[PDB]
């Protein structure tokens, strides 16, 4: 049985002046070491206050797009094999009011080498409960090309390993992930 579901993030599409959004959940395939026995399928379980809970089988895929329209929408990604689904999983809640709640006070990024950037930050004395953080990075003034990594909330620094395009300035968006939902990021631009 898989011990833990995969860590996951998202990207959105749609008119930014409307609440409805096509949300694409994103994860990496669970490695041999990560699950012990082979993961055969992934399941996306949804929950909203007025539609209840429903699950979508996505097979061997590593993304799932759904239309988000409700005041709050929680998603959980489960890893499945013949013995069952992962009991403990990561969760993300989409809530537009939560997207206006900050937690990152200061943010720095140092290009230690052409393929390694150290991110450092401080957090504000919270009220909402921080689950963890997610760093997004992409080329400044570009549409896609986004990469992400989950960061434990117990650290104040994180090393990002990437085959960065050195001539392009990169934009680093550190997102706080609260129990109540994904929060307001802190963003800095910098060369690598």
């Amino acid at each position: 049985v898989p011990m833990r579901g995969p860590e996951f993030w998202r990207k959105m599409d749609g008119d930014v002046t409307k609440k409805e959004r096509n949300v694409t959940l994103l994860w990496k395939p669970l490695t041999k070491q990560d699950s012990l026995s082979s993961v055969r399928r992934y399941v996306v379980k949804h929950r909203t206050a007025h539609n209840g809970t429903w699950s979508e089988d996505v097979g061997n895929r590593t993304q799932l797009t759904f239309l988000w329209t409700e005041p709050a929408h929680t998603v959980t990604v489960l890893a499945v094999n013949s013995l069952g689904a992962s009991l403990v999983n990561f969760q993300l809640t989409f809530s537009w009011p939560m997207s206006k709640v900050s937690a990152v006070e200061s943010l720095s990024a140092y290009p230690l080498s052409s393929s390694c950037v150290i991110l450092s930050w401080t957090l504000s004395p919270d009220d909402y409960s921080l689950l963890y953080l997610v760093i997004e990075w992409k080329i400044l003034n570009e549409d896609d090309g986004m990469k992400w990594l989950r960061i434990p909330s117990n650290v104040k620094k994180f090393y990002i390993h990437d085959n960065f395009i050195p001539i392009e300035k990169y934009q680093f968006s550190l997102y706080p992930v609260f129990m109540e939902g994904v929060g307001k990021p802190k963003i800095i631009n910098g060369f690598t």
Partner: nanobody, 129 residues
Framework: QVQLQESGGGLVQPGGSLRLSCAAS????????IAWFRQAPGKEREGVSC????????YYADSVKGRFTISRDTAKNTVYLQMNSLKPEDTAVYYC??????????????????????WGKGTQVTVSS
């Protein structure tokens, strides 16, 4: 004292153009992003256009894309909204509003009235024959 002030509104015939200005004071474009909203008769204040606080990325309401263009002059602490090929349904009071950075940063952001920290008094735009 934080202040946002719109100007440039007026009466235009359908097909015409107007350019709105929003002068800000008491804060800079470094700490807040300034975006445009509009409130048509009997409706709520809806997002029209924004520009990122991190880069020059811009986003628009579906009904105004291509016709409208937001721009800024950071040295003057002023934002603009160029409004072309105006339609009667564009009639509304237009507001500029500030939101603590970062804002308008990607498609994971929502330009919504409740997220704004400061508002201008608004400028009437009337598109009529």
């Amino acid at each position: 004292q934080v202040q946002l002030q719109e100007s440039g509104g007026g009466l235009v015939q359908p097909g015409g153009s107007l350019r709105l200005s929003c002068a800000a004071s008491g804060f800079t474009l470094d700490d807040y992003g300034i975006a445009w909203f509009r409130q048509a008769p009997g409706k709520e204040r809806e997002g029209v256009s924004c520009i990122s606080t991190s880069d020059d990325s811009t986003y628009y309401a579906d009904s105004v894309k291509g016709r409208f263009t937001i721009s800024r002059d950071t040295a003057k602490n002023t934002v603009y909204l160029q409004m072309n090929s105006l339609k009667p349904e564009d009639t509304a009071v237009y507001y500029c509003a500030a939101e603590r950075a970062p804002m308008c940063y990607s498609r994971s952001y929502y330009l919504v009235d409740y997220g704004m920290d400061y508002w201008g008094k608004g400028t009437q735009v009337t598109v009529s024959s």
